[PDB]
Amino acid sequence: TGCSVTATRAEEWSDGFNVTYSVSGSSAWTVNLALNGSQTIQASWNANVTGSGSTRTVTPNGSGNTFGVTVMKNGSSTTPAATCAGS
C-alpha cells in the first residue's frame, strides 16, 4: 500500500552512470536514494533530489514520477538502492 519506485541504469561511462528510477502507483511518493561505497550525486532531474553523506531524499515535482541522477562510480559501477513509502 505504498509507492512502488523502480530503478533502471540509463547512461554510463568510466566516471558515473545516469540511473533512472521509475515511480509508479502514486504522485506524492518519496524515493530515498542510497549511493554505494563512496559514490555521490553528480546531477539529477525529474525530481528534487538532495542529501549530504551517503543518502539523498528524492521528491516528485508533479509530472516526473521517474527521476534520473548521475552516480559517481568512484570505483563502483553498481546501481544505487532506492526505497519508497506511501505518505
Curated annotation (Swiss-Prot):
Q: What is this protein called?
A: Bifunctional xylanase/deacetylase
Residue window of the full protein shown: 247 to 333 of 644
Q: So what family is this one in?
A: Belongs to the glycosyl hydrolase 11 (cellulase G) family.
Q: What is the lineage of its organism?
A: Bacteria, Bacillati, Actinomycetota, Actinomycetes, Micrococcales
Q: Which organism is it from?
A: Cellulomonas fimi
**For the CBM2 domain, which residue ranges apply?**
1-87
Instruction: State its role.
Output: Endo-acting xylanase which displays no detectable activity against polysaccharides other than xylan. Hydrolyzes glucosidic bonds with retention of anomeric configuration.
Q: Which cysteines are joined by disulfide bonds?
A: none
